[PDB]
Scaffold this motif. Structure first.
Motif, mmCIF file in Angstrom:
data_model
loop_
_atom_site.group_PDB
_atom_site.id
_atom_site.type_symbol
_atom_site.label_atom_id
_atom_site.label_comp_id
_atom_site.label_asym_id
_atom_site.label_seq_id
_atom_site.Cartn_x
_atom_site.Cartn_y
_atom_site.Cartn_z
ATOM 1 N N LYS A 133 -12.078 7.469 2.481
ATOM 2 C CA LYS A 133 -10.888 6.908 1.852
ATOM 3 C C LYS A 133 -9.682 7.026 2.770
ATOM 4 O O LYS A 133 -8.869 6.101 2.863
ATOM 5 C CB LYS A 133 -10.613 7.590 0.518
ATOM 6 C CG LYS A 133 -11.729 7.444 -0.486
ATOM 7 C CD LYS A 133 -11.329 8.001 -1.832
ATOM 8 C CE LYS A 133 -10.240 7.155 -2.450
ATOM 9 N NZ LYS A 133 -10.694 5.755 -2.664
ATOM 10 N N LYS A 165 -9.889 4.461 5.456
ATOM 11 C CA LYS A 165 -9.528 3.155 4.922
ATOM 12 C C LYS A 165 -8.022 3.013 4.787
ATOM 13 O O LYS A 165 -7.460 1.962 5.114
ATOM 14 C CB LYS A 165 -10.194 2.921 3.572
ATOM 15 C CG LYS A 165 -9.888 1.553 3.010
ATOM 16 C CD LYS A 165 -10.222 1.439 1.548
ATOM 17 C CE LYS A 165 -9.321 2.299 0.700
ATOM 18 N NZ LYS A 165 -9.621 2.121 -0.745
ATOM 19 N N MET A 219 0.066 -5.145 -0.016
ATOM 20 C CA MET A 219 -1.194 -4.963 -0.724
ATOM 21 C C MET A 219 -1.091 -5.371 -2.184
ATOM 22 O O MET A 219 -2.008 -6.010 -2.708
ATOM 23 C CB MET A 219 -1.664 -3.521 -0.609
ATOM 24 C CG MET A 219 -2.247 -3.202 0.739
ATOM 25 S SD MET A 219 -3.215 -4.588 1.348
ATOM 26 C CE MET A 219 -4.859 -3.897 1.269
ATOM 27 N N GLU A 220 0.003 -5.032 -2.856
ATOM 28 C CA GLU A 220 0.126 -5.349 -4.271
ATOM 29 C C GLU A 220 0.513 -6.794 -4.538
ATOM 30 O O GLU A 220 0.474 -7.219 -5.694
ATOM 31 C CB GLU A 220 1.140 -4.423 -4.943
ATOM 32 C CG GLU A 220 0.812 -2.947 -4.826
ATOM 33 C CD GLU A 220 -0.544 -2.597 -5.405
ATOM 34 O OE1 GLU A 220 -0.939 -3.208 -6.421
ATOM 35 O OE2 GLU A 220 -1.218 -1.708 -4.844
ATOM 36 N N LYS A 261 -0.395 -9.686 -2.127
ATOM 37 C CA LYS A 261 -1.312 -10.673 -1.582
ATOM 38 C C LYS A 261 -2.703 -10.077 -1.494
ATOM 39 O O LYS A 261 -2.864 -8.866 -1.338
ATOM 40 C CB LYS A 261 -0.887 -11.162 -0.201
ATOM 41 C CG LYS A 261 0.438 -11.879 -0.170
ATOM 42 C CD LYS A 261 0.666 -12.531 1.183
ATOM 43 C CE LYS A 261 0.495 -11.546 2.325
ATOM 44 N NZ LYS A 261 1.440 -10.400 2.225
ATOM 45 N N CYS A 262 -3.710 -10.935 -1.603
ATOM 46 C CA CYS A 262 -5.080 -10.486 -1.425
ATOM 47 C C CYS A 262 -5.351 -10.250 0.049
ATOM 48 O O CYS A 262 -5.055 -11.096 0.895
ATOM 49 C CB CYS A 262 -6.069 -11.505 -1.983
ATOM 50 S SG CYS A 262 -7.791 -11.022 -1.772
ATOM 51 N N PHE A 263 -5.918 -9.089 0.354
ATOM 52 C CA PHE A 263 -6.175 -8.714 1.733
ATOM 53 C C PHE A 263 -7.137 -9.662 2.428
ATOM 54 O O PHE A 263 -7.120 -9.742 3.658
ATOM 55 C CB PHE A 263 -6.720 -7.292 1.776
ATOM 56 C CG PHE A 263 -6.942 -6.766 3.155
ATOM 57 C CD1 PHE A 263 -5.900 -6.238 3.883
ATOM 58 C CD2 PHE A 263 -8.201 -6.777 3.715
ATOM 59 C CE1 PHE A 263 -6.106 -5.749 5.148
ATOM 60 C CE2 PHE A 263 -8.410 -6.291 4.978
ATOM 61 C CZ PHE A 263 -7.360 -5.776 5.696
ATOM 62 N N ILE A 264 -7.968 -10.380 1.680
ATOM 63 C CA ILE A 264 -8.981 -11.231 2.289
ATOM 64 C C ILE A 264 -8.484 -12.665 2.369
ATOM 65 O O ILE A 264 -8.294 -13.204 3.463
ATOM 66 C CB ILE A 264 -10.306 -11.156 1.516
ATOM 67 C CG1 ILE A 264 -10.863 -9.738 1.547
ATOM 68 C CG2 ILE A 264 -11.307 -12.102 2.104
ATOM 69 C CD1 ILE A 264 -11.212 -9.262 2.910
ATOM 70 N N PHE A 315 -4.873 -11.069 -10.844
ATOM 71 C CA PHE A 315 -4.881 -10.452 -9.526
ATOM 72 C C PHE A 315 -5.738 -9.196 -9.509
ATOM 73 O O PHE A 315 -6.438 -8.928 -8.526
ATOM 74 C CB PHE A 315 -3.463 -10.137 -9.074
ATOM 75 C CG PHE A 315 -3.394 -9.604 -7.685
ATOM 76 C CD1 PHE A 315 -3.618 -10.433 -6.609
ATOM 77 C CD2 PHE A 315 -3.133 -8.273 -7.455
ATOM 78 C CE1 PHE A 315 -3.567 -9.949 -5.335
ATOM 79 C CE2 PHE A 315 -3.083 -7.784 -6.181
ATOM 80 C CZ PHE A 315 -3.296 -8.624 -5.120
ATOM 81 N N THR A 327 -8.921 -8.846 -6.982
ATOM 82 C CA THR A 327 -9.026 -7.787 -5.995
ATOM 83 C C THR A 327 -10.094 -6.757 -6.318
ATOM 84 O O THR A 327 -10.448 -5.971 -5.435
ATOM 85 C CB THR A 327 -7.684 -7.086 -5.844
ATOM 86 O OG1 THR A 327 -7.241 -6.618 -7.125
ATOM 87 C CG2 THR A 327 -6.670 -8.044 -5.280
ATOM 88 N N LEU A 338 -12.602 -5.806 -0.750
ATOM 89 C CA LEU A 338 -12.971 -5.556 0.637
ATOM 90 C C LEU A 338 -14.079 -4.521 0.742
ATOM 91 O O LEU A 338 -14.904 -4.575 1.669
ATOM 92 C CB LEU A 338 -11.744 -5.124 1.437
ATOM 93 C CG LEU A 338 -10.997 -3.849 1.053
ATOM 94 C CD1 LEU A 338 -11.508 -2.671 1.842
ATOM 95 C CD2 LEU A 338 -9.527 -4.027 1.296
HETATM 96 N N1 LIG Z 1 -8.914 -7.865 -1.131
HETATM 97 C C1 LIG Z 1 -8.499 -6.723 -1.683
HETATM 98 N N2 LIG Z 1 -9.407 -5.757 -1.919
HETATM 99 C C2 LIG Z 1 -9.000 -4.613 -2.470
HETATM 100 N N3 LIG Z 1 -7.772 -4.257 -2.844
HETATM 101 C C3 LIG Z 1 -6.895 -5.230 -2.597
HETATM 102 C C4 LIG Z 1 -7.165 -6.464 -2.037
HETATM 103 N N4 LIG Z 1 -6.009 -7.219 -1.933
HETATM 104 C C5 LIG Z 1 -5.084 -6.437 -2.429
HETATM 105 N N5 LIG Z 1 -5.547 -5.222 -2.848
HETATM 106 C C6 LIG Z 1 -4.769 -4.147 -3.443
HETATM 107 O O1 LIG Z 1 -5.119 -2.942 -2.815
HETATM 108 C C7 LIG Z 1 -4.676 -1.900 -3.698
HETATM 109 C C8 LIG Z 1 -5.309 -0.590 -3.303
HETATM 110 O O2 LIG Z 1 -6.573 -0.428 -3.976
HETATM 111 P P1 LIG Z 1 -6.735 0.581 -5.178
HETATM 112 O O3 LIG Z 1 -5.545 1.447 -5.275
HETATM 113 O O4 LIG Z 1 -7.059 -0.218 -6.441
HETATM 114 O O5 LIG Z 1 -8.040 1.392 -4.779
HETATM 115 P P2 LIG Z 1 -8.757 2.738 -5.232
HETATM 116 O O6 LIG Z 1 -10.062 2.919 -4.558
HETATM 117 O O7 LIG Z 1 -8.808 2.734 -6.760
HETATM 118 O O8 LIG Z 1 -7.691 3.842 -4.799
HETATM 119 P P3 LIG Z 1 -6.399 3.999 -3.871
HETATM 120 O O9 LIG Z 1 -5.164 4.094 -4.701
HETATM 121 O O10 LIG Z 1 -6.678 5.248 -3.032
HETATM 122 O O11 LIG Z 1 -6.428 2.772 -2.960
HETATM 123 C C9 LIG Z 1 -5.004 -2.411 -5.098
HETATM 124 O O12 LIG Z 1 -4.003 -2.014 -6.027
HETATM 125 C C10 LIG Z 1 -5.033 -3.940 -4.937
HETATM 126 O O13 LIG Z 1 -4.020 -4.567 -5.713
#
Ligand SMILES: Nc1ncnc2c1ncn2[C@@H]1O[C@H](COP(=O)(O)OP(=O)(O)OP(=O)(O)O)[C@@H](O)[C@H]1O
Ligand SMILES: Nc1ncnc2c1ncn2[C@@H]1O[C@H](COP(=O)(O)OP(=O)(O)OP(=O)(O)O)[C@@H](O)[C@H]1O
Ligand SMILES: [Ca+2]
Ligand SMILES: [Zn+2]
Ligand SMILES: [Zn+2]
Lengths: 694, 146, 49, 48
Positions: free
Chosen positions: A191, A194, A611-612, A614-617, A632, A636, A642
């Motif tokens: 984690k 990442k 991150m909150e 736009k979609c990372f992909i 959204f 995600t 991802l």
């Molecule tokens: N393609 C994507 N894949 C994953 N997350 C994405 C993507 N695009 C945007 N995000 C954002 O990335 C943020 C980070 O992921 P999230 O917090 O849900 O993960 P987690 O494994 O539950 O824990 P952590 O808070 O440590 O990341 C999410 O709130 C999501 O909105």
């Protein structure tokens, strides 16, 4: 399972409301009784597996042998209010009760968990695919409800991603995520890796390099998972097994050892606070501890030895835990530069790239891809560039025997691998080891640990050298690391302002030496004055030492100019020194520090916002997906997760190429060609089928 | 309650109730929030300042002891760095509060074999402790405001 | 959560919360799978009343 | 102020085409769309 796989293949490239999908739904409806029987077969045993593990069932379990009578089984199951009479009877029939009507429920539950898992998963995949491509057919919701337990059980393993397919359309791909893969992805170190990767790309990345950086991150993550699996724990042979156990133990507890070394440093310095110097032994002076307990004198020695040992173990843990990843990354980038760029075939870096110049030592080594998985990179580079540059010249560059390729293609030789240290001695690749040690000794973390070693060793020469290990909190505590980053962010600016301050102080020194020398008498005596500005070097030192540290500038230190022919000139001198040096320049330094604070904060905020939003992909913002409630969040978590792309890559690597499906083979070929167009860029499944879906 | 009750034991315990404006007045509450927002950072910088002062204390105790005489008397000197704890207290007490660092308090290094080493000591103390670290604290406060 | 364990079996657990039947609802939801008597002992309920 | 000026200049260049004024969002509908638009279609060096 094979029949279901054939059906899933029939659904390849199937659009929403496709005729083949509708025919599949019609076929399932035509066989509704049998499909319900199958789904019931699965859900009864899925429910039974958890029921037999429940406290309510264990209450009915009374036999000390761990068994249950059929009547007791009957009265336990109707107490659960989850099966019917016929279902309980069928479970009784399926239970291999002995002549005494005794049921071994532990094995009864596990009898079908493994044999039925693959078919259950494929049934879940089939129903999910049909539901998501025929979303307005009421006849399919009945099957979905009847398979609710199956879908729930397989939800954590049903991985779905979207790709831009060969049909120039977005396709949704379903595959299996293994328990080990998910568990390893949920480890805290993974984690953290990442998070660091996301920060790096989002902050200082470009969109053209984004997917390639992401795939490189996935590859490094796979290698890290392998290393974690290896170090995980559930006369030559005995020594080897104990050595690998010891090394794995050190690798697993690397951070605990680091913390222990820090704690030991704190203890050592606390002891050192009691030191005292006296002329008398406990014209030379004597240093000793001054205490009444009488114990910290040996305690200091014990702690020092323990600290050196713990630091040594930390270095071993590091080069057994992180050095493999360093070497893997370097070998991988070198191999890709060789093959896809011809770095040492065509461009030949121009002696100003120390990395490329050092990598020349590993090209012809027999064991160049030791950590990189591709052991055939040399073969591939030969087949790609030998025609244009020369097969023999490429073979000489890469240290290949052109003769052995044929025999390796022909057959496999099985020699004697003697387990002797003598035979192992000349198996060592000296040139490769030199290259690897150069890479290790040029790494910042390893260099830090080596410096920790050197300071610990010097601590035995003089115990006060253990004070340096107190700086370890700068990297141990992330808050202190960030705070010191708020200084190091603008280090070049800070050094430049210090130099400019030196120059302006030099100018003031020049003016003082030429004109205001008489004011620099720092002696209260009348017959032997102490003039600080009779020499230019002395005057400059006096300025840089006392004028900068004085609150009111140099005028605080030098003599009063009252009633002198140069009074006004000197007051201008003092005021301008105070304003330029004390006020403006120190203000610049403090402003650089505060601006570094603000810059770091806005970087973190920007990463979180990106991150909150736009979609990372795909790059589509949250505004579009939020047209549907929780759009959204669903996009995600399910569509463009991802983590699921990472899992898909591992799934492809582990799966057999003869068993790859069409979509999987497409992605695999494109991945091996390093073409990332299969990633959905600005398009998604919801967007492509807006009208059918809505 | 407890402070009010102790106020009858000693009337000066009623001074503590003057802190009630910290929560009574929302402006003061926000201003003190501009301090408490980065409290963890502030405590970490204070600890790091303690560590760097400890390092300077170690260097002084090893090398620059002769400069720490704080007695104008000639026959009974008051050496502040003959013990490491005393030296560390002297640093954390007078060096940090001095505008020009520890060099303001300790003796003049003019005409000594260790003059250059001592001026480097003083300048680096002034820059790291007085300038950079206090600047970090004030920047944390201003950043909490922003 | 560890401190909230003291209020589960109290006769007057939902004193301020309006739902005075939360214990009944939890029983009807989880008694089949975890045990009606065990849920009743956890929540201090008399199954007879 | 100087820092935000530099950041704004970089952001404007990376988000809008210097010639046409259409932002990167529109071109990114096609993969690498903005990169291709700024390197081949509306490259200012090519106008020079
Ligand atoms: N393609 C994507 N894949 C994953 N997350 C994405 C993507 N695009 C945007 N995000 C954002 O990335 C943020 C980070 O992921 P999230 O917090 O849900 O993960 P987690 O494994 O539950 O824990 P952590 O808070 O440590 O990341 C999410 O709130 C999501 O909105
Ligand atoms: N019409 C345009 N023509 C060129 N570049 C543009 C245009 N509109 C926006 N840009 C942006 O200008 C940026 C600066 O150009 P770029 O960095 O690619 O040029 P370079 O010659 O490779 O080197 P440098 O980094 O020194 O500019 C590009 O990243 C591009 O996104
Ligand atoms: Ca096949
Ligand atoms: Zn997306
Ligand atoms: Zn344009």
């Amino acid at each position: 399972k094979d029949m279901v796989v054939m059906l899933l293949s029939l659904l390849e490239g199937n659009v929403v409301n496709g005729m083949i999908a509708r025919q599949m739904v019609d076929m399932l409806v035509e066989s509704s009784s049998n499909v319900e029987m199958i789904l019931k077969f699965f859900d009864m045993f899925l429910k039974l597996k958890d029921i037999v593990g429940s406290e309510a069932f264990q209450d009915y379990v009374t036999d000390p042998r761990g068994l249950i009578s059929k009547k007791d089984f009957q009265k336990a199951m109707d107490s659960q209010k989850q099966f019917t009479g016929p279902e309980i009877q069928f479970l009784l029939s399926c239970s291999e009760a002995d002549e005494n009507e005794m049921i071994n429920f532990e094995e009864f539950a596990n009898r079908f968990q493994e044999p039925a898992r693959d078919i259950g998963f494929n049934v879940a995949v089939l129903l999910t695919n049909l539901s998501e491509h025929v979303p307005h057919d009421p006849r399919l919701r009945n099957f979905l409800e009847l398979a609710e337990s199956i879908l729930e059980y397989f939800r954590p393993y049903l991985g779905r991603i979207e790709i831009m397919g060969a049909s120039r359309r977005i396709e949704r791909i379903y595959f299996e995520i293994s328990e080990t893969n998910r568990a390893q992805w949920e480890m805290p170190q993974v984690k953290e890796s990442k998070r660091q990767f996301i920060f790096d790309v989002v902050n200082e990345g470009g969109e053209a390099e984004k997917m390639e950086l992401f795939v490189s991150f996935c590859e490094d993550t796979i290698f890290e998972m392998q290393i974690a699996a290896q170090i995980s724990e559930p006369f030559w042979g005995e020594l080897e097994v104990q050595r690998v156990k010891f090394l794995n133990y050190l690798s697993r507890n690397f951070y605990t050892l680091r913390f222990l070394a820090l704690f030991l440093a704190f203890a050592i310095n606390f002891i050192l606070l009691f030191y005292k110097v006296s002329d008398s032994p406990p014209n030379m002076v004597y240093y000793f501890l001054e205490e009444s307990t009488g114990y910290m004198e040996p305690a200091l020695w014990c702690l020092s030895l323990l600290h050196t040992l713990v630091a040594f173990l930390c270095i071993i843990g590091y080069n057994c835990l992180k050095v493999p990843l360093v070497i893997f990354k370097r070998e991988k980038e070198l191999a890709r530069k060789l093959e896809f760029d011809g770095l040492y075939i065509t461009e030949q870096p121009g002696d100003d790239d120390v990395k490329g110049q050092w990598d020349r030592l590993v090209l012809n080594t027999p064991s160049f891809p030791s950590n990189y998985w591709d052991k055939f990179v040399k073969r591939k580079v030969l087949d790609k560039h030998g025609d244009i540059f020369g097969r023999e010249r490429i073979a000489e560059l890469l240290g290949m025997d052109l003769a052995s390729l044929e025999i390796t293609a022909h057959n496999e030789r099985k020699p004697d691998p003697p387990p002797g240290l003598l035979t192992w001695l000349m198996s060592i690749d000296v040139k490769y080891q030199i290259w690897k040690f150069g890479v290790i000794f040029t790494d910042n973390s390893f260099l830090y640990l080596g410096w920790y070693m050197v300071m610990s060793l010097l601590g035995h020469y003089n115990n006060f050298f253990f004070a340096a290990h107190l700086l370890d909190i700068a990297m141990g505590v992330k808050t202190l690391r960030t705070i010191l980053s708020s200084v190091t962010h603008n280090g070049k600016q800070l050094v430049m302002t210090v130099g400019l301050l030196a120059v302006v102080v030099y100018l003031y020194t020049v003016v003082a030496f030429n004109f205001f020398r008489k004011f620099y008498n720092k002696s209260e005596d009348e017959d032997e004055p102490d003039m600080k500005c009779d020499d230019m070097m002395t005057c400059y030192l006096f300025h840089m030492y006392v004028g900068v540290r004085a609150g009111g500038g140099i005028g605080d230190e030098i003599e009063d100019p009252a009633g002198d022919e140069y009074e006004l000139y000197r007051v201008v001198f003092d005021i301008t020194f105070f304003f330029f040096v004390i006020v403006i320049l120190l203000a610049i330094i403090q402003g650089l520090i505060i601006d570094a604070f603000g810059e770091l904060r806005d970087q973190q905020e920007q990463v979180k916002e990106d991150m909150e939003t736009k979609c990372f992909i795909c790059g589509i913002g949250s505004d579009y997906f939020d047209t549907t409630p929780h759009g959204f969040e669903t996009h995600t978590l399910e569509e463009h997760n991802l983590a699921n792309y990472m899992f898909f890559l591992m799934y492809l690597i582990n799966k057999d190429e003869t068993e790859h499906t069409g979509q999987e083979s497409y992605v695999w070929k494109m991945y091996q060609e390093r073409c990332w167009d299969f990633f959905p860029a600005g398009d998604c499944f919801r967007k492509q089928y807006e009208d059918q879906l809505s």
